């Protein structure tokens, strides 16, 4: 019985190891991705605000 | 089935009416109506004809003044032909990649390169061809500092090269990736595996230098000593020192008991042991 | 008697060895139990945090979709404007019992950890897909806004 | 006799390896938690920015409606 | 270093120039009707000075400058930028003197809720509650603010956040020795969480707390309580909490204090006890 | 291949076209410069790409535009990152100056981290790395992003204990450990920090270490149960008698049950060498 139980335990441990390696790598990649998106959206909002401000100033200058 | 015939008929009617409309400023409406006809054909799920119409719409959009729409249309047409004549899909996706790099968005270009390499490897048998695209994508990703993507691409190309019997490239790539991962605080737990793989490849050349290689890895990475892989490798080498087939068979059976060995490792293990 | 005395005293030294080894094994099992217990709370907290992050990501994707639709409409309008045991019983005694029970409990807890880890792993993939899609939506929106402003500036003169 | 208790020493020989195996897993869990938390906070910041953007877009839409309808 | 004196001097000079500009703006408007160009430019000076001060580690000056800019730009009928400046001023004051931020955030919250943007108001309410909690022990106001934020979040259908707010509310309320609210909140949260895929693993914990919070009332209504939970969530029986609670009940049934102490000591030995559980366990031991 | 020659020739042609366009004296010139720089980057001609990018940035800044100027400055800096380490620092400092002027402090925080990394890996200098890491930590803590500040402070303390007087390490370690002790998720790690601090005390003289470990044991009861406290008590007791063998035996056993980070090895070696 010793071999059965002990090998079962070791198999379980190794499986957990593998799962965690995989999804930790996944999380790291996700982190890089989110880093990019943040700056992209910030630049978008800034530029839209600036350009619409040009619009208001110009249209009020003409009117 | 009554669904396929009905959807095909509806899509054909829409595409024909779109053709009549364009044949009758007009370029923009023609492009939009052809896009709608292509969408209805895609819902009709005649992949070849839908892709043909969609690529024709893409070319007409090229006739219209815009680039982003052209590239989007090209990539969608490529995905449509994904399940058709590979050459046309490869051509369209290559044109889309060229357009995307022209704008400096290297990341999407690398993604498309990886996609075309995947289709090139699964569908056809040419492996050496896919290596070029994989290396190009790895180069772009490394240039843009996305280390994870570069590591993935390098690992894949190294595996293929190791299969192809150009072990030198495989050993270089595996050692570089392993040491770089060891340096990084995270992913360190993985490093051992890479080193182990390298040893096997280096074994194919000769047995004596394998001892020196494993000792070099031992001194470079002490933790490698406590991993089961190092014990298995040294035991296999010591057994091979005497020509008995039983010993390594028993050792591999014992190791396999815990975890099943993958196809790649099993193939190389058979190749090493048989000779 | 000297021979017997010295051999028996070596036997007593070995009895001390036996005692020390048994005690070390017991302590190691206790520490294993403690560590296995400790992992679980971190697992649970990770799970709940992941749930919350997923909900937030869905909210932001909805916001981006609304942004795109509204800006397109505005642009168009503006254009229109124009198991038995675990240890061999060499000598029995109480000390082996606690060892066996501790190993049993460790096994059970690892069994739970299996499912915990797999369930947690599942979510990340859908989160990845969602993030990938939101990038593309945002990029398209930005390109739209830039070209729209350029057109708004070119038509004037 | 000596053989039996040499065997007892063999018995205490695997428990340490097992204790190493578990100690690895625990540390890995602990390392994972921090990454999860960091991604969370960053997501909240992004969400805040998105709300600001949408609000301004809606306000600008209303202003454009005012201008076009009243001027027309 | 140089930073302190240089930043202070340059920022003071810039602020004085801005003050002179605003003083001259009235004359310019009266004599020529220049509009708001002068006022807008002055707002720009104030914002830049505030940022520079915040760089210079002089938080109070940054707060004052932000408040001045907010007041002016509100006088120019742009409520949104006024709210933004007030939010930054509150963050600035948060570090030196903890009470101006309260009123600044209150003004910002009123402005935001005027338009129905409830989520931002909820976030600001949570921040104010945290401010009350960290320095003072004026728990009552913290409970009020947390309840308001949870109400808004529930009104916006954003679940899994209202749960955390209500859990905080219950955890604090159980401290003041008024146990009904804690029991209600804990049981509701536990039964809601029972059915979620991911959250299921945590659910058990909540029940345990309720039971303990339910013990102080009278032992007889604790025993029955456990039964009602165990039949509904059979897996509860597997966890350690049920075993510990049963042993505690047995020990307390015969005034055997030593056994109760020993059991608590062992359970703490395996896992370190939190302060909240320690206080509640001592209070229960008082009997 | 065709790539090198063709891209280089077209890049020179576009640079000449942009120079001629400015010679007439404007945005068209900036776009031409940007396209030339992109194709240079494609050509693997890493150097001289940052030069074109910097030229475009200066021309763009000429017309009061500041956002795209900062973006292109940062791009040029990272382009120079591998070919010439020194210039990337100057470009990133320019970008950081502009961003800090506008108050996007998080961006300034990341660029400082990057600069300190380059000062630590390619060139050799520790003081500059410490200064830049400290500045980033201050910015982040001002914006109350606690985890980043903790990471930066931990790195600064590690380096200072590596070469400088130990006071900075003691202060940073004590503060971080005390802050982390109360938090629910992070509490399990607290021990480590405290442990490190005490070792730093040992380097000065034993009595300081004994008093410090007493104070920490009083402050954090769980510390008394840690294997680390037992190791430290044993090591101190051995050191009090001028008996090196006990020192070595205890260190070897503790290493046997768990590996050493190679920081503990250095510090334990230093302490043993001064036992005399």
Residue numbers in the entry:
A (entry chain B): 197 to 259
B (entry chain H): 0 to 23, 36 to 286
C (entry chain C): 1 to 82, 130 to 204
D (entry chain A): 188 to 259
E (entry chain F): 0 to 286
F (entry chain G): 0 to 24, 38 to 288
Copy out sentences from the published article reporting this entry, exactly as the authors wrote them.
The membrane-anchored SNARE (soluble N-ethylmaleimide-sensitive factor acceptor protein receptor) proteins provide the energy to drive membrane fusion in various cellular contexts, such as intracellular trafficking and exocytosis. Supercomplexes of NSF, α-SNAP, and either a syntaxin tetramer or one of two binary complexes of syntaxin—SNAP-25 reveal atomic details of SNARE processing and show how sequential ATP hydrolysis drives disassembly. NSF comprises three structured domains connected by flexible linkers—the adapter N-domain followed by the D1 and D2 AAA+ domains. Six NSF protomers come together to form the active form of the enzyme, a homo-hexamer.
A representative 21bin20S model (class #5, 3.39 Å) and ɑ-SNAP—2:1 binary SNARE subcomplex model (class #13, 3.74 Å). We again performed signal subtraction and local alignment on ɑ-SNAP—SNARE sub-complexes from all five classes with ordered spire structures (see “Methods”). This procedure produced a single ɑ-SNAP—SNARE sub-complex reconstruction with an overall resolution of 3.74 Å, sufficient to assign characteristic side chains, identify the SNAREs forming the complex and their directionality. A model composed of the ternary neuronal SNARE complex with synaptobrevin removed was docked into the density, preserving a distinctive kink in the peptide linker leading into the SN2 SNARE motif of SNAP-25. In place of synaptobrevin, a second syntaxin molecule was placed to complete the four-helix bundle with little deviation from its usual backbone configuration of the ternary complex. As such, the stoichiometry of the syntaxin—SNAP-25 complex observed is 2:1, the dominant species in solution. Sidechains comprising essential layers repack within the core of the complex compared to the ternary SNARE complex. For example, the ionic central layer (0 layer) is reorganized; Arg56 of synaptobrevin is replaced with a second Gln226 from the additional syntaxin molecule, which adopts an extended rotamer to mimic the arginine it replaces. Three ɑ-SNAP molecules bind the 2:1 binary SNARE complex; a flexible linker between SNAP-25 SN1 and SN2 blocks access by a fourth. The 2:1 binary SNARE complex forms a twisted, parallel ɑ-helical bundle with a series of characteristic SNARE complex layers preserved. This configuration also places the N-terminal portion of the linker, bearing cysteines often palmitoylated in vivo, near the membrane.
